[PDB]
Each structure stands twice: as C-alpha cells, then as structure tokens.
Amino acid sequence: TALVCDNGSGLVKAGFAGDDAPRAVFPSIVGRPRHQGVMQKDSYVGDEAQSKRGILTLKYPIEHGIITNWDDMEKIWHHTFYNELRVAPEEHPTLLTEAPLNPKANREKMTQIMFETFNVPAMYVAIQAVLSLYASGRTTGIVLDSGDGVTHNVPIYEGYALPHAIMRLDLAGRDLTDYLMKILTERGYSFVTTAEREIVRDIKEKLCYVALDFENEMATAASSSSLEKSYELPDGQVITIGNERFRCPETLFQPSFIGMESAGIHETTYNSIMKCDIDIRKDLYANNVMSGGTTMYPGIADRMQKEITALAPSTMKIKIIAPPERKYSVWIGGSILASLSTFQQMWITKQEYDEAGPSIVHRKCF
Amino acid sequence: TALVCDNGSGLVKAGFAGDDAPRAVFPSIVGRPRHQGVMQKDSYVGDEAQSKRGILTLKYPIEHGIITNWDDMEKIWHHTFYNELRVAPEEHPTLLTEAPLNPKANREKMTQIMFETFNVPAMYVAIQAVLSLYASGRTTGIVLDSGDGVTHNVPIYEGYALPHAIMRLDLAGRDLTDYLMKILTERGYSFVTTAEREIVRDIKEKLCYVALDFENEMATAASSSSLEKSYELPDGQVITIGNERFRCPETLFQPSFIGMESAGIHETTYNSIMKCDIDIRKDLYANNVMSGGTTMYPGIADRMQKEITALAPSTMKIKIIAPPERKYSVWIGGSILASLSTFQQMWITKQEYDEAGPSIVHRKCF
Amino acid sequence: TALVCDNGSGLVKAGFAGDDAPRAVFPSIVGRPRHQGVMQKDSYVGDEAQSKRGILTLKYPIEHGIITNWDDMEKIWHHTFYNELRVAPEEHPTLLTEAPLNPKANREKMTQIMFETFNVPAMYVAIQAVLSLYASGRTTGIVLDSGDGVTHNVPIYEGYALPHAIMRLDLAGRDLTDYLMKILTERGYSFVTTAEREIVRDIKEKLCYVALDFENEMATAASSSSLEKSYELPDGQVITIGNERFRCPETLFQPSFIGMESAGIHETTYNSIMKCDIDIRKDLYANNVMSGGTTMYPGIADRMQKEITALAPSTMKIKIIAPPERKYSVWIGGSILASLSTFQQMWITKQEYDEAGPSIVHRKCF
Amino acid sequence: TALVCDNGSGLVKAGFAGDDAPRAVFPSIVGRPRHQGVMQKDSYVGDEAQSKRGILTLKYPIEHGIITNWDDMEKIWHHTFYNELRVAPEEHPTLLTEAPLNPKANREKMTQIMFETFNVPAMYVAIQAVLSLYASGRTTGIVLDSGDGVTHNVPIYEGYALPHAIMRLDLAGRDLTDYLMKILTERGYSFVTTAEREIVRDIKEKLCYVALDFENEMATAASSSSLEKSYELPDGQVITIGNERFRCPETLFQPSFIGMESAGIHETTYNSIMKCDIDIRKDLYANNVMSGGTTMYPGIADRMQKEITALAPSTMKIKIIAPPERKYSVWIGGSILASLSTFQQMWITKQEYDEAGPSIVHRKCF
Amino acid sequence: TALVCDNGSGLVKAGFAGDDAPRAVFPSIVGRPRHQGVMQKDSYVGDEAQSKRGILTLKYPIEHGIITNWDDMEKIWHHTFYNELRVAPEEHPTLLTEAPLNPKANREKMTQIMFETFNVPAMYVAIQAVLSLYASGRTTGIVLDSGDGVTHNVPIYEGYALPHAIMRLDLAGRDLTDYLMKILTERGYSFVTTAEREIVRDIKEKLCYVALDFENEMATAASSSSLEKSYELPDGQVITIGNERFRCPETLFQPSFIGMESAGIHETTYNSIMKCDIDIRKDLYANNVMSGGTTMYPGIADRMQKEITALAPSTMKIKIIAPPERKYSVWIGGSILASLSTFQQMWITKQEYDEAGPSIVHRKCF
Ligand SMILES: Nc1ncnc2c1ncn2[C@@H]1O[C@H](COP(=O)(O)OP(=O)(O)O)[C@@H](O)[C@H]1O
Ligand SMILES: Nc1ncnc2c1ncn2[C@@H]1O[C@H](COP(=O)(O)OP(=O)(O)O)[C@@H](O)[C@H]1O
Ligand SMILES: Nc1ncnc2c1ncn2[C@@H]1O[C@H](COP(=O)(O)OP(=O)(O)O)[C@@H](O)[C@H]1O
Ligand SMILES: Nc1ncnc2c1ncn2[C@@H]1O[C@H](COP(=O)(O)OP(=O)(O)O)[C@@H](O)[C@H]1O
Ligand SMILES: Nc1ncnc2c1ncn2[C@@H]1O[C@H](COP(=O)(O)OP(=O)(O)O)[C@@H](O)[C@H]1O
Numbered sequence A, B, C, D, E: 001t002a003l004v005c006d007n008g009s010g011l012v013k014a015g016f017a018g019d020d021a022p023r024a025v026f027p028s029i030v031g032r033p034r035h036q037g038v039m040q041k042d043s044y045v046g047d048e049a050q051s052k053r054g055i056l057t058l059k060y061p062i063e064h065g066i067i068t069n070w071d072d073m074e075k076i077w078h079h080t081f082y083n084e085l086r087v088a089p090e091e092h093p094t095l096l097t098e099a100p101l102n103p104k105a106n107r108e109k110m111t112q113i114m115f116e117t118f119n120v121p122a123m124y125v126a127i128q129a130v131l132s133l134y135a136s137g138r139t140t141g142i143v144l145d146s147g148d149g150v151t152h153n154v155p156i157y158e159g160y161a162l163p164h165a166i167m168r169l170d171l172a173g174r175d176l177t178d179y180l181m182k183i184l185t186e187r188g189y190s191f192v193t194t195a196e197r198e199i200v201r202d203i204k205e206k207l208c209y210v211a212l213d214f215e216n217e218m219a220t221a222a223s224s225s226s227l228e229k230s231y232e233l234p235d236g237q238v239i240t241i242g243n244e245r246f247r248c249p250e251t252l253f254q255p256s257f258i259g260m261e262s263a264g265i266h267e268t269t270y271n272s273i274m275k276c277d278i279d280i281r282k283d284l285y286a287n288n289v290m291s292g293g294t295t296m297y298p299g300i301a302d303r304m305q306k307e308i309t310a311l312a313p314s315t316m317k318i319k320i321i322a323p324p325e326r327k328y329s330v331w332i333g334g335s336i337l338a339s340l341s342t343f344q345q346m347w348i349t350k351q352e353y354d355e356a357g358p359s360i361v362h363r364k365c366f
C-alpha cells in the first residue's frame, strides 16, 4: 500500500491509501528547550512538543507553504514514518502534496530527501486543490483551499486545470491567529510567546465565526452582550471576548485588517472564475468547493454564498460545497488518487529519478 | 437504402434516402483541448465539441466549401456513420454534395476516402443547387444557395443547367459571424476565441434580420430604441445590440462592408440571369429559389424581391420562393434524388472506380 | 381523303383535301439541347422547339427550298402525320409541293421517303405557283410566290405554263430576317443565336412594312419620329425601331442591300412578262397574283403596282391581286386540286413507282 | 502631323502619322479607390491604375468595341493627349478606329467629343480591318482582327470591301481571360477581383498557346507532365497550370466552352469567304491576314492553316499571313493611311461637321 | 500651436506639435493611500504616485486601450495640462490617439470631456498606427503597434488603410508584466501588491529579451549559467533570474503561455498581410513597421524577421523597420500630422460638435 502524507503549514496528516481518514494528525512543530536543565531530549516534535510547550520554543518548519527549515522538516518526516505510522518508508510509495505556485526548489528538495534519506521506492507530489476535488467526487469546480499558510483558488473543468486562472494568497490560518493575538490586547490579554500562540489558535478554533453581515454584527456586539463568550486558559484564568470572535475571520474577506492590499477570498474566487472561459463559468459558479481548516468557521459558506452572489450575474446559481469533512479533503483525495489503477503509472520511481535528474519532478506541476 | 450526407462548411446533415428530414444534424467541428489535463479523449467532434468548447480549440475542416483538414474531415465522417447514424458504411451507397466551381482534387479525395477508408459500395457527388431544385418540385429556376462557406447561383431551365452562368461567392454565414464579432466591439463586447465565435453565431441566428431599406433602418435605430434586443451570454451577462442586428446581414447585399469587391447577392442573381438566353429569363425571374441557413434571416425574401424588381424590367414578375424548410433543401433534394429509380444507374460503384481511375468522378460536374 | 402538305422553308402547312384552311401550321424547325442536362427528349420539333428555344439550337432542314438535312426532315414529316394530323399515312394519298427549278434529286428523295418510310399509297409533287393560281380561281396570271427561302415568278396563260419565262430568286423571308438582325445592331440591339433569330422574325412580322417611296420615307424617318415603334422582348426589355421598319422589306425591291446582284421582285416580274409572247402580256399585266408570307407586308401591293406601272406601257392596266388569305394560297390551291375528279388520274401510286423507277416523278415538272 | 489613336477595348495605342510604332501603349482602364483614405487622386488611368490596382476597382470604358462609360472614356482620351503624347489636340487631325457593325451612336458621340471637348481641327473614323490591310502592304485579303472585345472578319478584294460578307463575333481576349479565371478554380486558384483579372491576363499572355490537335494535346497533358508551367504571383506564390494553357485559347475555335452558339474563328473565316463571289475566293484563301493581340498565341497560325485547309477544297492554297508585328497592325496601317496624300481629302473638318450635322460621320462606314 | 497627447494604457506622452520629442512622459497611474494618516493629498498622479507607491494603491484608469475609470482619467488629463505642460487647454487644439476597434463610447466620452471640462477649442482623435507611419516617413506599410494594453496590426498602402485586415490583440506589456510576476515565484520571489508590480515592470525593461530560437535558448539556460542576471530591489535585496529573461517576451510569440488562444504577433502580422490584396503584399512584406514600448525588447526585430520569413514565400523580401525611437513613434507622428497645413481642416471645432452632436467624432474611424 502507498503512504499519503499531507504536509500542511500547520498540521501533518499521514496515513495509508485506501483508508477514509488520516491515521496520524499532529502539529507540524519542532520545540526546543529555552531554559536550563538541572535534572531529557534535545528537541520535541508534534504532540510531544505541544504537551511540553511551557518550556519550549516552538517553530514551524513550513511557512506559507514553503519549507524554510529543512533540518526540522526531516525530524517531522522521521517522526511521521517511524513513530506515528510505524512503517519502513523504503517499502511504500509516498504521495506528497504541495501548494500551487511554490518555488521549484521546494519540491526538488522534498524529492531528494525522500529518495536519499528515507529511500522511498517511488513518490509523487500532487497539487492540493486537485486532491480536494477527488474527495468530493467531482471533475469540475473551483477549489478554495485555505490551510495554515496558503489560501489558493484552482478552477478545474472536466478534469482540465486552468493554470492561468490560479490565484494564490499568502493569508491563511496562521495570519488569523497572529491577528487575533493583536486584537486580544484591546481587552488586556497579552499572548506573546510561541506557546501562547498555540493557546490563541485554540481560542480561534472554539469561539471564532464568520458574520453574515459584518457591520450589523459590529453594531450588535457594541449594543448588547449576547455575543460574549468565555474561555478558560490553561492556568484557570477566564477571558471573555466579544466582537473579536467575528473580527478575526473577517480578515479573510477584508485582508486590509492586517495591512494586506489583496482582495478577500470572495473577490479572489470571483476573479479566478472571470479569468476562465465564458462557457465554463456557469459550472464553476455551481461548484465552489471549500477545503482546509480555515474554511471550518461557522457561517463561512453562507457568507461566501452571499458575497459571490452579489458579484456574479443574478441568473447564475451560486452553490458553495462545504462538506463537514473538508478539513481532511486533501488527504482523502490523495488516498483516493493513490488507490486508482490509472495512477499506478504516475509514480516517479527511484530509477527514473537517477537517470532523469531532479527535473523529472516538475510534471503536471503548476 | 442509400445514405444522404450533406457536408456543409458549418453543419453536417446526414440521413437515409426516403426520409423527409436529416436524422443527424450537428456542427462540422473538431475540438482539441488547449489546456493541461490533471485528472479523457484527445479530440471532440460535433455536438460533443460544442458542449465542451470552453476548454477546446474549435476548428472547421471545411473552409469555403473546400476541405482543408483531411484528417479532421475523416473524424467527422467516422462519427457520422458510426455514432450519429450508427450504420455500416460498407452496406449503403452514399450520396455526397459539393459546391460548384470547387477544386477538382477536393472531390477526388472525397471519393478515395469513401472507397478505401469506409469501403462504401457505391457513391455519387451531386451539385447542391440541383438538389435544392428537386426539393421544391421544380425543373426550372435559379437557385440561390448560401450556407456557411459559399454562396452560389445556379440557373436551371427544364432540367438543363447553364454552367457558364454559374456564379460563386466566397461570402456566407461564417463571414457574417466574423463581421458581427467585429462590430460588436463597438459596444464593448469582446469575442475572440473560437468558442466565443460560436456564441456570436448563436446571437446572429436569434437577433439578426434583413432590413427592407437599410438607410431608413439606420435612421430608425439612431433615433429611438425600438430595435434594441437583449441576449444573455452563457455566464449570465446580458448584452444589448441595436443596428448590429441588420448591419450584419446587410453584408450579403453590400459585400464592401467586409472589404470585398464583389456585388451583393441581388446583383449576382440578376447578373446570372442576364448571362442566360433571353428566352428563359422570364421563367428564371419567376422561380428564384432560396436555400441554405444564410437565407433564413427574417425579411431576406422581401428584400431580395425588392432589389431584383429594381434591376429587372418592370414587366417581369419577380417571385422569390423561400420555403420554411429551405435550411435542409439540399438534403431533402438529395433524399428525393437518391430514391428515384432513374438515378439507380448514376451510382459510381467500387468496381468502376478501380478500372476507370479517379477521373470517373467528374461526370456531370461543374 | 387526301393529305395536302405544303413544306415551305419556314412553315409546315398540312391538312386534308376539301378543307379551306390547313389543320396544322407550325415552324419547320428541329431544336437540340446545347447545354448539359442535370435533371427529357433529345430533339424538339415545330412548336415544341419554339417554346423551349432558350436552351436549344434551332435548325431548318430546308434551305432555299432545298431539303439539306434529310434526317431532320423525316422527323418533321413524322411529327406532321402522327402528332399534328394524327393519321396513318399509309391510308391517304399525299400531295406535296416544291419550288420550280429545284434539283432533281430533291424530289426523288422526297418520293423515296414517302413510299418506303411512310408507305403512302400514292403521292404527287405539284408546283407551288400553279396551286396558288387554283386558290384565286384563275387560269391566267403571273404568280409571285415569296415564302421563307425562295421567291419565284411563274406565268400561266389559259392553263398553259411558260417554263422558259420562270424566274427564281434565292431571296425571301429568311434573308430579310438576317438583314433585319444586321441593321438592328445600328441601334445597339444584338441578336446572335438561332433563338434570337426567331425573335427578330417576330419583330419583322409585326412592325415591318413596305414604303411607297423609299427615299421620301427615309427623309420622314430622319426628320420626325412618327415612324418609331416599340416592341417588348420576351424578357421585358423594350426596343424601338424607326427606319428599319421599311428598310428590311426594301431589300425585296433592292437586293443590293444584302449584296445580291439580281433585280428586285418588280423588275423580275416585269422581265418574266417580257419573256412571254406579246399576245399574252396584257392578260398577265392584269393578273399579278401574290402568294406566300413574304407578300404579307403592309403596302407591298401598292408598291408593286407603282413599280410595274412605271416599267409597263402606260396603256396597260396593272392589277395586283393580293387576297388576305394569300399566306395559305399554295395549301388552299393544293386542297382544291387534290379534290378535283380530273386530278384523280394524276396520282403516282406505289405500284407505278416500283416498275417505272424514280424517273416517273418528273412529269409536268419544271 | 496627324494623330493616330487606336482605341481598343483593352489597350490604347496612340502616336503620330509617319512613325512605325505607337508612341503610347497603355491599358484602357480607369481605377478608383475602393477603400478609405487616411493619409491623393480620385481616379487613376492607364499604367498609373495598373501599378496601384491593389487598392483600386478597375473598369474598362469600352466593352465589346462599344464605349459604355463616356465620362471614363474622356479621361482616357485626355490622358492620351496631354500626358502620354503631350500635345495640343486642337492642332492635329485625329484618325480614330472602330470595329465594324458598331452602333451608329458610338461613332457620333466620339465625333462630338473630339470636336466640342478637345476641339480637334479634323478627324476621321476608319475601319480597323482596312487599316490592318494597309499595314501588310496588300489590297486583297480577308482580315481576321481579334483584340480584347471583338473578333471580326472583313474580306477585301482589289481595294473593294464586301460588307455583306463581314462577320462579327463578340468573343475576344477579355472573354478568354474570364474563361481562364474560371478553369483556374479547378486547381484551387481563386482570382475574383478586377485587379486579379489583370494577373490572369498576364498569365494568359505568358503561358497560353494554341494546340495543333486539341484532343491529342488533352491526352498528352493527362498522361505526362511536360506541358506543366509555373508562374510566380505578385506576392511570391507559385502556381502551376497544365492543360489550361491550351484550353483557354481553344475557346476561339470552340466557342461552346463559354456557352456561345457561334462557330469558331476558322469556320467564321471560311463562312465569310463562301459569302463572297466565287471568282475572288482563291485570292482570299491565299491572303488570310491576322491582326490584334488575340492572334498572338503561339501556334494559332498553324492551327488556323490546318482548320481552313480541312474546310476549303483541296486544290486551294491556304496561306495565313501573321507578321510578328500584327499586335499593332491597326495602328501601323492607320499611320500609313493618315500619311497618304490621297487621304488628305477624306478628313472631316470642324466646318463640315457644323453644317452637315452628325450624319456626315457615316461615310464609307459599315 | 497644437497639443499632442498620446494616452497609452501605460504612459502619458504629451507635448506640442512641431517638437521632435514629448515634453511630458509619466506613468498613467492614480495612487491613493491604503493606510491611516497620523501626521497630505488624497490622491497622487503620475511620477508623484510612483515615488510614494510604498503607501499607495496604484490603479491604471486605462485597461486594454479602454478608459475604465473616467474620474481618474480626468485627474491625469488635468495633471497633464496644468502641471506637466503648464498650459491653458482652452487655447490649444488637442490631438488625441486611440487604438483601433475600440468601443464607440470611449471616443465619445473623451470628446465630451475635452469640450465641456477642459473647453479645448478643437480636437481630433487619430488612429495610433497611422501616426506611427507618419513618424517613419512612409505611406505604405503594416504597422505592429504594441504598448501596455493593446497590440494591433494596421496595413496601409499608398495612404489607404485596409480596415478589414486590421488585427487587434489584447496582449501587450501589462500582460507580460503579470506573467513575469507569476514565473518569478518559481525562484521564490513574491511580488503581489500594485507597487511591487511596478518593480517587476522595471525588471522586465532591464533584463528581458527575445530569444532568436526559444528551444535552443531554453537548453542553454538549463545547462550553463551565462544567461543569469542580477537585479537589486529597492530595499537592497538582490534577485537573480535566468530563463525568465526570455520566457516573458516569448508570450508575444506564444500567447498560450498565459492561456490565450490567439496566435503570436508574427502569425497575426502574416495573417493581416494575407487578408490584403495580393498586389500589395510584396510592399507590406518589405515595410513591417514596429512601434510602442513592447517592441523595445533586444532581439525582437531579428526574431520577427525570422518568423515571418518562415511564413512568407521564399522570394519575398521581409524587412522589419524598428527605429531606436519607436517607443515615441505614435507621438512623433502625431506631432508631424498636427503640423501639416492639409490637416488644419480636419480639426473638430467646438462649434461643429454642438450642432452635429457626438456622432461627428466617428469620421475616418475604425
Ligand atoms: N474549527 C476550526 N475553526 C477555525 N479554524 C480552524 C478550525 N480547525 C482548524 N483550523 C485552522 O486550520 C489551520 C490549518 O488547518 P489545515 O487545513 O490542516 O492546514 P494545513 O494543511 O496548512 O496544515 C490552522 O491554522 C487552524 O487554526
Ligand atoms: N435562423 C438563422 N438565421 C440566420 N442564419 C442562420 C440561421 N440558421 C442557420 N444560419 C446560418 O447558416 C449557416 C450554415 O447553414 P447551412 O445551410 O447548414 O450551411 P452549410 O451547408 O455550409 O453547413 C451558419 O453559418 C449559420 O450561422
Ligand atoms: N405578316 C407578315 N409580314 C411579313 N412577313 C411575314 C408575315 N407573316 C409571315 N411572314 C414571313 O413569311 C415567311 C414564310 O412564310 P410562308 O409563306 O409559310 O413560307 P414557306 O412556304 O417558305 O414556309 C417567313 O419568313 C415569315 O417571316
Ligand atoms: N502574347 C499574347 N498572347 C495572347 N494574348 C495576348 C498577347 N498579347 C496581348 N494579348 C491579348 O490581346 C488583347 C488585346 O490586344 P489588342 O490587339 O490591343 O486589342 P484591343 O485593340 O481591343 O485593345 C488582350 O486581351 C490581351 O490579353
Ligand atoms: N526597454 C523596454 N523593454 C521592454 N518593454 C518596455 C521597454 N520600455 C517600455 N516597455 C514597456 O512598454 C509598455 C508601454 O509602453 P508604451 O509604448 O508607452 O505603451 P502605451 O502607449 O500603452 O503607454 C510598458 O508595459 C513597458 O513595460
């Protein structure tokens, strides 16, 4: 069987092709002690670093879909194969994922490590938005994939991708966490360390939601108190947040909140559709597929439906497809693809990599 | 039974002799994907290419009645026999059509393909304007046949053709579509791709008409707004056109709109009659037969009646015969001819083609 | 009853002896298609060829009273018996006519065809000018017979012919038609084909007349416009002719207009009278009988009266007998002769023709 | 000195009497721009219109020897006098030419323009075939003159013309150009515009020839490829023609190729001789004089010799006189005639034209 | 003196007629602050917006030759007259330019603003490709004008335009900048904001060039490193690009790189020549005039020469005219035209605009 590893900027999702859910889901972090030992490992990975984060400096080796720390990334891959999955990587072909419009050297270093450090027999790097469409059982649709580092739109029609219409936005979950950390200081809550950033991320996943109309919601939060929620910190302190619950996800639709010039995910989706041929726009309007953890906010599909309806012609039927399992859509689609008999010829074996060089990894790549 | 295939520049009309309507009417197009596949056939033909035109480059194998892409033309013939008609071509004699004054090699290659690729038992290539006269139940008349590529006038009197009076004009429906694409840019509508050319052709068939007096109609469209019509594009956008509705078909009467030096179809019809013997002109004046899709504009028979009346002597009775089924007149006449018992000796069998060579196909051909 | 067939160079006049008018009068033409058939007979005869002359080449089998195309002449005789008269020629004796001073083989071939192809029981070939005198109820007079091919003068006195005084002129209606075609080019009217020659013949029969004084009429046509007449062509075009109306028949009196050296019909008539015995000239002067279609011009009897009066002595009484039915005088006289009881011994039966050979047909023949 | 202007349907040949060649030879065309000027004259004449024909509509003011556009004909005469010859027409008597059997008003309008617009002192309109006989130094012969519009036969014997034997055929070089344009479509070459008609005329003058035996030549062209010739178009495209080289001039001998009913130039020449007196036919048989550009095909004199030999009695000596300068024979003969001292009394002066009216111009005219 | 303003999609070029270079050349941009002021104008135009682009959102009011933001376009015209040229527009006639095949309302709004907002005495809207031909001192040639928004081919022959042969391509410098921004992400360089798009445009103008053979150049860049160039960003960062230098301009010859279906500028130029009359193609082949900033790539004339030579017949002489000043050819030609004495009647004065309405501005317009 093949291994399917979805290395996101935030979470590692690994498992075996044919399964319906990842077997190993843990944070893509490496923690190192920032104090002096007096009485123990030198670095902690994943959930181990998450339980000891009080005395660690946590670092993400992947930033905006681009692997920046290759020594830390190998520790995470090593822990994925030997600790979480407990397999020998030299026996399973490995399907990896990558965001579109990434640097070419990122995929070439991933391939060199898998073939020369882990000695995988074969491997393949798929585009995350294409796997997300396999998971929904579709061949046509525009995928909005938003994870921890990257948000991207990829339109696909009858199995054909339109690379010139691909949009990429370096604004996802990690930027929303940093913005929530900033606006929490308005109530006197100070989260500074990398360990406290993990607390704010947990606050974001529990209490944040997308408002249907942002200006009406800002007036409701300023008048009454029905939007206030409480949250208990790990040390028993209780914090209460009001309009920060919907001001944080609103950055997805108004990136100027964090000083970005780009348009929101609704205009970016609409602009990607308008770059496509006029004859396929009607099918793309009816097949807006959402995937990734950053699309898991309550009310984001209704807000997305409302914003694109206002941009598109009134005759078009806008349909946002947001399954409840869309947090694992890239992995589930990769599990489906790696099990197809037609795909078994797409593997890049170790023999082909030695004779064709690193240039063989850029096939069907955009 | 015999097969009747009317291969126009725009549409394929195929069926069985004895029927009153073609069984298969689909566009004579071959589409090939112009993007990268990521998830499918290599080429699409006919209505299949029309429904996927968003991701295809559409090409017509026939241009101005002359087959230019013989590999694509065989795909269309193959799809006609096996997909649309679902017959074995080696069991039915095939009646084909052709515009007059075509290159000799065009008919010789059509015959070689039908005998050596499809292995038809017998075949015959008729002149389209002669079949159009069979459809109207006449033996005398001048036929104005205008399709997608060619407009031609063929005068016939008591079953005798006058080849020296045959006029051919490389200006038909496809040139009107290209001219409509050009004048639509005056309102800011940009149709560029081959798929968008199919949208403009659909606009032309729905909204364009022939003005009785062009200068009076240009003054009416410039003063009020009663001539404005709206049309919804496939993506919900609504376009509104005014004088473009009658400026596009006016090119048939003023070919200088597209930079051509020839005279309009009314003068060409009159010049063809004046090249005939004086004793038959009165019968030709009363039997102007229209055929083809480009004669389907509302008001073209009244305009044709008005223009030829102004050219002919005032004592002559000008009568334009334009039946509502004239879009299929060539096929209907070919169905009538292929069912005549007298015609059963006109078939060019496979045996005659082997002993007489390709020169046998140029009999009763002009 | 007997058949009377007057085979002129221009018209066939056939009927039954005892009647007062021919039952079948149609042009002596055979037309053959000069174009390609695409949708019909191989040749057309008589009025059928006249209605389809637009697509035919028309040929006269008789030229200057001499049958030149014997295959076409048999088609005309066949159509006369079976289509126009609808009789069996093997049951009726046939009276035929012939111009004087014809080749001997012309009458011998006519007799061989009537006896061996149509199997007539008996036949007789009369001289046309003698029949013309029977029609006027006379035994004395000089007959001026002018048809389509031949003009001839035959003087007869008390039932006796004077063959040495017979004049023959190869100038008749067909030469006048050709001359009218030539002088019509002076006004820009171009009649070239054999079908257009039939149009000019119709113009000649409607608008041409004989001027009493040619030089005074030429001055009147050159000064005013009262002699101009209009004529509508079969295609609606209107032509206008002035002095051509009387210049065409003037060729009969001035054969030098068409390059002939002979004298006009007035001098030829006078020369024929002066070749006769002096004692019969007074009776011939008073009995100038006109016959044939070429004597049907308005004013030809007054002009003939004026010209012969100027040549003859002033004491003689010149009387031109021109009945209104003189276009059929040869047939009417043949109908009278074939009904006489005295003539019933003059028939050349099939039995006499077999035993006496072809030489029996030259009896009372000049 | 006198001016000699030979206004043919195709070329203008002008010069001074006494010279042996025309000083000005240019096409008789008037071109007008058929596009929009954005950056120039309103009309171009002659060689100027020929060098700018790409953006012009070219029109011939003379069609079949008959001046149809009198405003354009005056531009050509104006350019002849002031630009090409650079003379004052009010100082030189002008000898003009005309085809026989032309409309009377054509010569009367030419005379009115020369006397009232150009104010020539005297003028004379000669018959083209008579001038062609002056050029060959003969007084007896039948002239076959074939130019761009008209082909005509004029027999002359000892200085006497036989007008009744004059044949005129509206089939010359321009009809051969149009027929070559038609049969070039058999190889896929499309020449449509008036500018492209000038290209086909240049092809005809370079590659066309008269076959000695047409059926043997058709078999040679269909078997091998030795008759194929190449020709480079003005834009670098190379066309190759085979049997079209001799099928185009064959129309002169088989006018049915273009749907004409008349006989070829060989039968027309023979028919003209047979209309002449029997005593002069032997001299006409030995003096067949060819003139005009349409007699410049290679092998037309040998073919003409062969065809007339087959029609004439075997004892007659058929001699076709075709000098290499016969393209200018009408002008050269007009230069000889205008220099004769005997001719100096034949001029129609301006004084005679005012007192005698337009009727004076029809003297020695047929 | 007259004002000549060449409003391109990218640059404004303004000056006075009679000068040899524009006096004011600045970017056609309007920038507005996208941050909060704490310590200043509300919008910046031209070079002022370019020096403060760090805190601005830059917008082009002209997109693909079509003015989309009319309020911003008036700010640019206002800054052109009063700041850059420092004149009173109510005293100078203004010559404006426009791309062919533009919407009719674009030119009508430009005229209404110049007459009612700036109160110019007269104005004229010329076609840019016609002015480019004035600059090269020619009357014949096909102009390839490629600026920031539009690429168009206009063939002109002897001062006559052929509007039916005009090609327009919505692919120019701005699309090349966007494509360079996309392929720079392959090396890890992220340019996203509108201010960073101006940095990429500066990279394109310094380092990009057209490869003579694209496939050989791709092999050279992949083997060695001689094609690598370095560029210093405004903040001191140094980027290095290799094959992106010639992959960006290659989009002009392979528009499929950016997902466009149209053919490259070489085939578009050849197709425009083949739509012209055959007699003018040789002159168009020798006079390919390049203009605009997008034709300023090193090696584009040699590549254009090589591509058209492969399409045209081998006998034709292909000559690409690319002067070193072709970046200002439209302005220089407009300065020449506005100084011609013949042009002084072409001005559309304020009086004519009031009585004739907005329809007067569409004269000599295509
Ligand atoms: N219920 C939730 N609501 C909002 N955000 C969530 C939720 N669950 C996860 N996320 C966010 O999703 C982001 C990453 O999810 P994932 O799709 O795994 O991205 P990646 O593929 O980059 O690892 C994290 O930043 C996390 O904060
Ligand atoms: N209702 C209509 N009005 C105007 N044009 C039409 C209409 N229907 C069809 N056409 C035109 O007729 C053309 C071809 O019709 P057809 O007679 O099938 O030609 P062909 O025989 O060349 O295929 C097409 O260009 C199409 O645009
Ligand atoms: N009304 C008429 N006026 C002048 N010519 C006439 C008239 N009617 C007939 N003809 C001429 O008479 C000629 C033949 O008449 P017809 O006496 O039948 O001669 P034929 O006996 O040779 O057939 C034709 O050429 C025709 O043109
Ligand atoms: N070498 C040649 N071969 C064949 N045809 C020629 C040649 N030269 C000229 N012609 C033809 O001669 C025709 C006219 O010649 P010309 O005698 O000047 O006639 P016109 O007197 O009517 O102007 C033109 O149609 C031209 O095509
Ligand atoms: N040296 C150069 N090399 C390549 N492109 C250039 C160069 N200089 C200018 N350009 C490009 O030319 C384009 C616009 O130039 P211009 O001719 O002024 O167009 P417009 O008339 O549309 O303003 C810009 O996109 C710019 O990038």
Ligand SMILES: [Mg+2]
Residues within 6 Å of the ligand: A007, A008, A009, A128, A146, A147, A148, A292, A330
């Ligand atoms: Mg992800």
Ligand SMILES: [Mg+2]
Residues within 6 Å of the ligand: B007, B008, B009, B128, B146, B147, B148, B292, B330
């Ligand atoms: Mg058709």
Ligand SMILES: [Mg+2]
Residues within 6 Å of the ligand: C007, C008, C009, C128, C146, C147, C148, C292, C330
């Ligand atoms: Mg008779």
Ligand SMILES: [Mg+2]
Residues within 6 Å of the ligand: D007, D008, D009, D128, D146, D147, D148, D292, D330
């Ligand atoms: Mg001539």
Ligand SMILES: [Mg+2]
Residues within 6 Å of the ligand: E007, E008, E009, E128, E146, E147, E148, E292, E330
């Ligand atoms: Mg520009």
